[PDB]
Amino acid sequence: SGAIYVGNYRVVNRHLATHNDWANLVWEDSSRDLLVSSTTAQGCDTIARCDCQTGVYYCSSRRKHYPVSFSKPSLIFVEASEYYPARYQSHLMLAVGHSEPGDCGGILRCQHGVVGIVSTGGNGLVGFADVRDLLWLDE
Numbered sequence: 172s173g174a175i176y177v178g179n180y181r182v183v184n185r186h187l188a189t190h191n192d193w194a195n196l197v198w199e200d201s202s203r204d205l206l207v208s209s210t211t212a213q214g215c216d217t218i219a220r221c222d223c224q225t226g227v228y229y230c231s232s233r234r235k236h237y238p239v240s241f242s243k244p245s246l247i248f249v250e251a252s253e254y255y256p257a258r259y260q261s262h263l264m265l266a267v268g269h270s271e272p273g274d275c276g277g278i279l280r281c282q283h284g285v286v287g288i289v290s291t292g293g294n295g296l297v298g299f300a301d302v303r304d305l306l307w308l309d310e
């Protein structure tokens with residue numbers, strides 16, 4: 172689990188969105204595994220606006236942060252799970268590192284701020300849903 176709080180927005184993995192997230196929906200995209208809902212309280216996470224390919228992510232299944240090199244956001248095939256059939260997930264970045272399904276929502280950050288959240292993995296590869304292109308999160 173995990174979310175990003177920026178301004179009057181909350182960003183979460185779409186497959187983990189709650190009834191309240193859907194009742195206050197701003198935007199969702201199944202192909203990216205993202206959903207953004209509105210909040211009353213003001214969030215103060217900073218979103219990175221860059222093309223970094225190195226950063227640190229939080230791994231709840233190890234209670235540890237790990238530095239990684241990651242690919243640029245791209246369309247990657249993702250095997251079926253109980254939340255989606257087999258499909259291409261867009262805006263996804265992979266890195267070599269540990270993750271388990273419950274690790275979704277862990278944040279990946281570079282020196283410029285939040286880059287994305289854990290969304291896929293397996294076979295020693297962790298995948299992050301990018302949020303750097305959602306410029307509207309800052310207004």
Ligand SMILES: Cn1ncc2ccc(CN3C[C@@H](C(N)=O)CCC3=O)cc21
Nearest residue numbers: 204249252254270271272290291292293
């Ligand atoms: C985060 N992670 N680390 C290992 C691993 C193995 C399997 C999965 C399967 N999966 C894929 C997600 C998607 N974005 O399509 C939806 C939720 C989910 O359980 C995730 C995994």
Ligand SMILES: [Zn+2]
Nearest residue numbers: 221223281283
């Ligand atoms: Zn950066």
